Amino acid sequence: KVPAATFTNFTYTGEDDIYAKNPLKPNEFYSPILQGCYPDPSICRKGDDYYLVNSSFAMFPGVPIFHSTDLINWVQIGNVLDRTSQLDPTTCGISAGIYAPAIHYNKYNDTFYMITTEFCAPCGGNMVVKTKDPRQGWSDPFNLHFGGIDPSLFFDDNGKAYLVHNDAPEKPLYGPNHRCIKIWEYDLEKDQIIPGTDKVIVNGGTDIEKKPVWIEGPHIYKKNGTYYLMCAEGGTGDWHSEVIFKADNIYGPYEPWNNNPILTQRHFLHLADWAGHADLVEYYGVFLGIRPNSKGNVNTGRETFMLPVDWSGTWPVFENGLVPLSIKQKMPKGVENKTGKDGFFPNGNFTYSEDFKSENIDYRWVAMRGPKENFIKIAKEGGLQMTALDANITEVQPISALFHRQQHIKYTAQTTLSYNTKAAQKAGLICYQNEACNYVLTVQTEGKEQVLVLEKTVRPQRQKDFKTEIVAKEPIGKLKTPITLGVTTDGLNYQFSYTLNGEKKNIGGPLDAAVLSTNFAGGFTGALVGMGVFK
Numbered sequence: 071k072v073p074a075a076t077f078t079n080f081t082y083t084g085e086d087d088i089y090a091k092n093p094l095k096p097n098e099f100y101s102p103i104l105q106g107c108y109p110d111p112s113i114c115r116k117g118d119d120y121y122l123v124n125s126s127f128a129m130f131p132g133v134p135i136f137h138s139t140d141l142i143n144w145v146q147i148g149n150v151l152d153r154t155s156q157l158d159p160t161t162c163g164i165s166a167g168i169y170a171p172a173i174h175y176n177k178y179n180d181t182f183y184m185i186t187t188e189f190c191a192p193c194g195g196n197m198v199v200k201t202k203d204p205r206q207g208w209s210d211p212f213n214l215h216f217g218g219i220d221p222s223l224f225f226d227d228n229g230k231a232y233l234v235h236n237d238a239p240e241k242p243l244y245g246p247n248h249r250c251i252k253i254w255e256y257d258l259e260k261d262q263i264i265p266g267t268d269k270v271i272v273n274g275g276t277d278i279e280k281k282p283v284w285i286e287g288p289h290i291y292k293k294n295g296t297y298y299l300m301c302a303e304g305g306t307g308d309w310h311s312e313v314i315f316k317a318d319n320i321y322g323p324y325e326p327w328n329n330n331p332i333l334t335q336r337h338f339l340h341l342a343d344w345a346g347h348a349d350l351v352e353y354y355g356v357f358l359g360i361r362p363n364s365k366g367n368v369n370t371g372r373e374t375f376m377l378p379v380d381w382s383g384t385w386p387v388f389e390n391g392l393v394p395l396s397i398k399q400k401m402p403k404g405v406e407n408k409t410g411k412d413g414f415f416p417n418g419n420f421t422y423s424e425d426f427k428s429e430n431i432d433y434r435w436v437a438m439r440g441p442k443e444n445f446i447k448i449a450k451e452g453g454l455q456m457t458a459l460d461a462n463i464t465e466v467q468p469i470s471a472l473f474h475r476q477q478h479i480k481y482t483a484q485t486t487l488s489y490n491t492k493a494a495q496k497a498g499l500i501c502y503q504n505e506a507c508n509y510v511l512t513v514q515t516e517g518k519e520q521v522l523v524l525e526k527t528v529r530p531q532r533q534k535d536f537k538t539e540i541v542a543k544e545p546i547g548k549l550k551t552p553i554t555l556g557v558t559t560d561g562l563n564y565q566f567s568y569t570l571n572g573e574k575k576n577i578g579g580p581l582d583a584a585v586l587s588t589n590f591a592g593g594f595t596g597a598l599v600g601m602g603v604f605k
Contacts, residue, residue: 072490073447074470074603075497075513077454078552079486081423082599084478088341088361088397089418099142099407100417101399102359106475107371107596108134109306110170110287111356112222112349116177121204122356123150123184124374127167127595128159129436129473133184135173135204136415140405141354141376144415146433147204150184155192155210156199159439161466162190164504165593170287170347172222178229179258184208185233187219196221196235198261212261216254216268220302223256224290224320231256232320233263234299236286239273247283248274251301253290253321269321275303276313276326283309287347290320293381299324300386302346306372306594309336310346312357314385327384333357333377333391342395344372348388353379355388359395360588363479363561367587369503370476371596419478427452434475436598438502440468445603453488458495458603464505464527464538471500471602476586484556484569485601489513489520489549496523496604499555501564503586503597504529506536511555511566511577512604513546520549524566524578528585531592542578546570557599559583 089100104111110125118139126132131149138144151157151168159167166189174183185198188211197211198221214221218237225231237252255267275282287302299315311334315324333355335345341361348357358372376399378389401407410416424432429448437445447455454472461467474483485499498512506529514521522544529536546553546568554569563580584590586597 071457072493073455073457074493074495074605075456075490076449076488077426077456077485077601078452078488079423079425080474080483080601081421081485082474082483083421083481084419085480085482086419086478087480092397094398094407094418096406097401098398099401099409100397101377101395102361102373102375103142103144103356103417104136104374104415105370105417106373106477108374109358109372109594110347111358111374112170112172113351113356114173114175114182115351116175116182120351121173121182122374123171123173125168125170125186125594126436128162128164128190128439129167130157130159130439130441131436132157132159132168133171133186134433137204140402142401142405143408145413146415148207148433150199150204150208152207153210154441156208157188158191160191160468162439163466164595166190170220172220172289172349174223174225176225178225183223185221185223187221198223200261214263216252216263218252220286220288222289224292226292226320230320231258232290234271234288234290236284236288239270243274243278244281247281247305249285250274251285251288251299271299271321271324272301272315276315276330289349291350297322297324298386300348300350302348303331304334304336304346306347306358307344310334310344311336312346312348312388316384329385331392332386333388335359335395338394340394341397342375345375345391345395350379350386353381353386355379355386355391361479363583365562365584367584367589369583369586369597370479371588372594422474425452426454435472437472438469439466442472444468445470446472454601456601456603458605462604463500463508463510463602464536466505469602470604471502471600473500473502473598473600476597476599479561480559481599482556482558483599484554486552486554487513487601488552491515491520491549498602499557499566500600500602501557501586501597502600503591503595504593507585507591509557509564509566509581509586510602511557511568513549513553519545519547521545522568522577526581526585530590541581544577
C-alpha cells in the first residue's frame with residue numbers, strides 16, 4: 071500500500087553524431103528503422119498492410135509489433151505477448167525468454183501467426199500464437215513438439231503447411247557450433263507438427279567443410295515455382311551473415327547459391343556490424359545489426375535495419391548488403407519521411423517527453439520479468455504512481471521499474487518525481503543492462519530527511535559474484551517539492567545529476583559505459599533507462 075513516488079515526467083533525448091553529421095534529403099530515411107534493442111526482425115504482409123516484430127527476451131510485454139503501409143513510417147500497435155497467460159517471465163534469465171520471432175500471414179485461411187521459442191514460463195520452448203486481426207490481440211500459446219530455436223512457418227499452394235527451424239545434429243562434427251535446419255509438415259487443424267515428417271534440409275551451413283557457425287533464422291519463400299530457404303549463418307556476433315538456398319521441392323535438396331553470403335559486414339574492421347538474421351517481404355529485407363561505440367562496445371543492443379532487395383532474377387540480392395552500410399537509404403518512390411511525426415515511431419535524433427497523463431501508456435515502456443500493472447497506476451492529475459514490489463534491483467524477480475530502451479550511444483534523459491515522504495521508500499532513475507549490471511540513483515530517507523544515493527552493481531559475463539557499491543551520496547534536506555533526476559552519456563561514460571530548488575548538480579563522477587554493454591555482461595539485450603522504486 072501507499073506508493074513510493076509519482077513520476078510526473080520522463081524525457082529521453084538522443085544525440086548521436088552520425089545523424090547530426092548526415093542530415094536527410096527529402097527522399098531519404100535513416101537505417102536502422104528501429105533504434106535500440108529490436109533484434110531478430112520478422113515481417114509479413116496482408117494487402118496494403120505490413121507487420122513487423124522483434125525478440126524481447128525477459129522484457130514484458132514481449133514481442134513489440136509495428137504496422138506500416140510504406141515500410142518507412144511505422145506505428146507500434148502493441149506487443150504480441152501482452153498477457154501473463156502467453157508469457158510469465160517472473161524468474162526468466164536476462165538472455166532467455168523470447169528468442170527470434172517469425173510473423174506470417176496465411177492468405178489461404180486469412181489468419182496471422184506469431185511463432186517463437188519461449189525459454190521461460192508458461193511454455194519453456196517452441197510455441198505459436200494466432201489472430202485474425204493484430205489490433206484485437208493474439209491467442210494463448212500452442213505448445214509445439216520440437217527442440218532448437220528460430221521456428222518459421224510456410225504455407226504452400228496445395229493446402230499443405232510446413233515448419234522450419236534450427237536444431238542440434240545427432241552427430242556433431244565440430245562442437246556446439248554445428249547446427250542444422252530441419253523442416254516438418256504442419257497440421258493447421260491441430261497447430262502441431264506431424265510426427266515422422268521431419269527432415270534435415272541443411273547440415274551445418276552453405277559449406278560444411280568450413281565449419282559454419284550456428285546456421286539459424288530459416289525462412290521459406292516460394293517464387294516462380296521454386297522454393298527458397300534463407301538463413302542466418304556465422305552467429306549473431308562478429309561473423310554474422312545471411313545465406314540463401316533453393317530447391318525444386320519443399321523437402322527437395324536445397325543447394326546454396328554459389329554467391330554466398332548475400333548480406334554481411336564481417337570482413338570490415340575499420341558504423342554497423344553483426345549483420346544477419348533477415349526476413350524478406352514483397353522486395354525489402356529487414357535484418358539485425360549493432361552500431362558499436364569507439365571502443366567496439368554496444369549499449370544499444372541489436373537493431374532492426376532495412377535494405378532494398380532485387381529479386382528480378384533467380385536469387386535475392388540485398389542492395390549494397392556486402393559493402394559498408396551507411397545511415398542513409400533512399401526511400402521508396404512517392405513516400406515522405408514522417409518518422410517522429412504524428413503517431414509514427416521516431417528515428418534519427420529526437421526527444422521523447424512523456425507526462426503519463428493517460429492510462430493507455432505508450433507501448434515503448436516495458437517492465438522486467440512481469441507486468442507494470444502489478445505496480446503502476448495513473449494519478450487523477452496524471453503521472454506514474456508506482457508502488458514498490460518486494461524485489462531489489464539485483465534479483466532475478468519482477469521489479470517495480472518502467473523502462474525505455476537505450477536507442478542511442480549518446481543520450482541525455484531526466485525524470486521528475488514527487489517523493490512520498492510517508493512511505494519513506496526508494497524512488498529514482500535507472501540505467502539497466504541486467505540485474506547485476508546497472509546504475510541507480512535514488513532519493514531515500516534517513517531520519518526525517520531525504521538523501522540521494524548513487525549505486526552501481528557490476529558483473530562481467532564469466533563471474534558469479536557481485537556486490538552493490540555506493541558510488542556517491544548527498545543529503546538534500548526535507549524534500550518539500552518535486553525533484554528532477556538526470557543522466558547523460560557521451561558514449562564512453564554515464565554522468566548522473568539532480569536538479570532541486572533551481573540548480574543542477576552532478577552526483578558521482580563518470581561511470582564506465584562498458585559495464586552496460588553486451589560485450590561486458592554477455593546476453594542478447596541492449597541497455598535500458600527508466601524510473602523505479604525499491605525497499
